[PDB]
């Protein structure tokens, strides 16, 4: 009863946006449609970012420790306790937000129609949006889903598709 975090590579060579996703990865839509977010983790040469990455890795090598990033992330145990505290909640979506969820879903659908040759979407898209918004509600530790949760779920899906395109 587990969530799958998959990482694929293209069948041959580098990724190529000229081709379709199933042509790039050589894995059928029966697999690809089960997922909720499809992300393209791109990598281009970029001089200053490469310099910083190399400085980071060289510090890791010569000191056996992460460099000072001048940010204080939460410790791993605190993150674990937080996620347990935030997933203990079981929010519910209010019925007044059904119309807004409908509007967001249909406009995303119709943008796919109008601008990207009706690329594949279905009712599981709406179900995935609702699951993402409820996960956001759990994360915010509020037992009612809201406009901001729906907006951020829609935004997350749209930016994942933007990474693909």
């Amino acid at each position: 009863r587990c969530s799958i975090l998959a990482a694929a590579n293209p069948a041959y060579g580098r990724y190529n946006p000229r081709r379709s996703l199933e042509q790039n990865i050589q894995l059928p839509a029966a697999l690809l449609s089960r997922f909720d977010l499809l992300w393209l983790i791109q990598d281009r040469p970029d001089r200053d970012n490469d310099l910083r990455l190399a400085q980071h890795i060289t510090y890791v090598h010569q000191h056996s420790r992460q460099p000072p990033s001048q940010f204080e992330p939460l410790d791993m145990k605190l993150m674990r306790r937080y996620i347990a505290m935030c997933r203990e909640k079981q929010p519910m979506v209010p019925e007044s937000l059904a119309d807004y969820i409908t509007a967001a879903y249909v406009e995303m659908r119709r943008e796919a129609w109008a601008s990207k040759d009706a690329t594949y979407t279905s009712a599981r898209t709406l179900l995935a949006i609702l699951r993402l918004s409820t996960a956001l509600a759990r994360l915010r530790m509020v037992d009612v889903v809201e406009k901001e949760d729906v907006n951020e779920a829609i935004r997350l899906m749209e930016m994942s598709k933007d990474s693909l395109l």
Binding site: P28, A29, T102, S122, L126
Partner: protein, 619 residues
């Protein structure tokens, strides 16, 4: 003398326990004189057992419940004596094949497989689990029959805890070692081993499941099949195992099993129905009502649901060799509602099957021969098409099957039989099955430019056997998509008062279909005959003019099937022009969907051949 008895090392008086259980039977009344009703039910039905609830025993008398749980091996025979004494004090001349068995049970599990301990040995327990295997019927000897091989004098010996007191000498004569066990004059009772896994819902996180052995006897043997989920009440036994079969040394670590006292299945889910169905059949637009009742959980495709309804009802089987079965094919992208339709109607129909055309399927479409692993003997596993010999066979991923399976399905659809040429075995199995198929495009999503056959890439010969073919394409239309989205959010906000209503609708749909199949046998009227005849000629007209061909005689057979099925739906028992018109309408709608070339419209030879007329002139 019974009053002197106490259970060994227990200080409980058997006679007092018997009296307490007798007054329990006589005076317990409130599950909302209870068990005398069960005794009367035994008296009229003729089944020698009584089910009793341990919670009722507990609420009536806590001490009696404690005695039952702690010392079942003595207390349960005491309860048998009590119930038989009451039953034959009443009903004085009723005859039973056996004395009644009391079968105490707890409504829910008292323990789980992981927490069973040596403290629980020879104690009554209840556990939940899933059945993994069930052995063949084992005969257990109950009384040994001996005969003297010198003088044919016979004697009978009773079984002492699993061993025989063999007579060393004969009584009539006096020869030594002359008494021989006559196996088939001895007396036997049924026994069976069952291997039971802890439930998936009961396993701890990420652990491999635990398993126990149950032993059932007499009438509880043949009540449980593999895959069932049961709450089994029984006595937790511990027995020794000998180190090797020819030596009586035993391992210090004992084997354990459960002597089954009671089974309760926990995954199972007439005139009062006929009276409803008779008037509901003559209610107006009952056809539409049933078709809309099919698969409420998906947004509506009217002609697909109508075709599946007529497939469920089927034509009339008569004799010559013409199939009453109706074959339906669904096409569309992955992510459409076709698989939901398949799984729904598989859950609905009797004698149904659901499997994948892919070679990785759980149960195959074709028949095969295999070594039964728990026995090593050969078994002929007839495939799903043969198992669904009077039902619907749902085939998901129908495009992905290999050419041998395509040949098997061609054979089954044409001839309604499956040939067996296995090593040694030669036979003609029966496969009068209605195939409901769900295909996919070979590409990722449906190509609008290419035809149905060109997209799914199945042979035209096999495509020509299907009576109806439909498509689940969704328009790029707000008028459809907005209301679909409203239906989806409403489906999220589904509640139990709608679930019960839809379950009732599905249940009366099941009863309707079963009652139709039970007796209703349509025949053709003269007007219906004329309508079908002129329908075939009319379908031939549009193509025969201009020199092409637009129909062929097997489509008349399909129309006959659909008309008979529609008469079956409306309970007419006489096929009429109403049924024939509906058959023509639905068949032409299926053709409008499936046989439409994007350029020249509906082309009939796209089913008779690969490609179409335009392609044949393009090359």
């Amino acid at each position: 003398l019974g009053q002197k008895l106490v259970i060994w090392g227990t200080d409980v008086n058997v006679a007092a326990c018997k009296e307490n259980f007798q007054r329990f039977l006589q005076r317990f009344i409130d599950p909302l004189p209870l068990y005398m009703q069960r005794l009367g039910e035994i008296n009229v039905i003729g089944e020698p057992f009584l089910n009793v609830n341990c919670e009722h025993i507990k609420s009536f008398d806590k001490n009696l419940y404690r005695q039952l749980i702690s010392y079942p091996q003595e207390v349960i025979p005491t309860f048998d004596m009590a119930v038989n004494e009451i039953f034959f004090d009443r009903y004085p001349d009723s005859i039973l094949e056996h004395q009644i068995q009391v079968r105490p049970f707890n409504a829910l599990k008292t323990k789980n497989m992981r927490n069973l301990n040596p403290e629980d040995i020879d104690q009554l327990i209840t556990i939940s689990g899933m059945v993994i295997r069930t052995s063949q019927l084992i005969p257990e000897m109950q009384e040994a029959f001996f005969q003297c091989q010198v003088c044919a004098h016979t004697t009978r010996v009773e079984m002492d805890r699993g061993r025989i007191a063999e007579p060393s000498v004969c009584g009539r004569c006096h020869t030594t070692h002359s008494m021989a066990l006559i196996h088939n004059r001895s007396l036997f009772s049924d026994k069976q081993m069952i291997k039971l896994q802890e439930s998936p819902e009961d396993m701890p996180a990420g652990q491999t499941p635990h398993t126990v052995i149950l032993f059932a006897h007499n009438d509880l043997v043949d009540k449980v099949q593999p895959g069932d989920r049961v709450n089994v009440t029984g006595i937790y036994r511990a027995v020794p195992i000998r180190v090797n079969p020819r030596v009586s040394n035993v391992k210090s670590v004992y084997k354990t099993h459960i002597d089954v006292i009671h089974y309760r299945k926990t995954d199972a889910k007439s005139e009062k129905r006929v009276e409803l169905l008779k008037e509901l059949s003559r209610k107006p637009d009952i056809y539409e009502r049933l078709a809309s009742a099919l698969a409420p959980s998906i947004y509506e495709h009217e002609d697909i649901k109508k075709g599946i309804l007529l497939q469920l009802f089927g034509g009339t089987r008569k004799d010559g060799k013409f199939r009453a079965e109706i074959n339906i094919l669904l096409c569309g992208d992955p992510g459409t509602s076709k698989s939901q339709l398949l799984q729904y109607v598989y859950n609905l129909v009797p004698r149904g099957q659901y499997t994948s055309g892919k070679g990785s399927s759980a149960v195959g479409l074709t028949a095969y021969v295999m070594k039964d692993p728990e026995t090593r003997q050969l078994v002929l596993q007839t495939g799903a098409l043969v198992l669904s010999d009077n039902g619907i066979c749902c085939i998901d991923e129908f495009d992905k099957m290999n050419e041998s399976t395509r040949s098997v399905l061609h054979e089954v659809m044409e001839q309604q039989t499956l040939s067996i040429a296995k090593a040694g075995i030669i036979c003609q199995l029966n496969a009068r099955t209605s195939v409901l198929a769900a295909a996919n495009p070979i590409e990722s999503q449906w190509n609008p430019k290419k035809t149905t056959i060109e997209n799914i890439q199945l042979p035209h010969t096999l495509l020509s056997r299907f009576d109806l073919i439909f498509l689940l394409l969704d328009p790029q239309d707000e008028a459809y998509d907005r209301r679909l989205a409203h239906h989806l959010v409403a489906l999220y906000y589904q509640s139990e008062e709608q679930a019960e209503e839809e379950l009732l609708d599905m249940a009366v749909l099941k009863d309707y279909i079963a009652y139709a199949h039970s007796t209703i046998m349509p025949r053709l009227s003269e007007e219906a005959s004329q309508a079908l005849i002129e329908a075939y000629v009319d379908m031939r007209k549009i193509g025969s003019s201009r020199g092409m061909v637009s129909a062929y005689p097997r489509q008349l057979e399909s129309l006959i099937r659909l008309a008979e099925a529609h008469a079956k739906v409306r309970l007419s028992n006489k096929v009429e022009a109403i049924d024939v018109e509906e058959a023509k309408r639905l068949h032409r709608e299926a053709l409008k969907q499936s046989a439409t070339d994007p350029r020249t419209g509906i082309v009939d030879i796209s089913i008779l051949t690969t490609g179409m007329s335009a392609t044949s002139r393009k090359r």
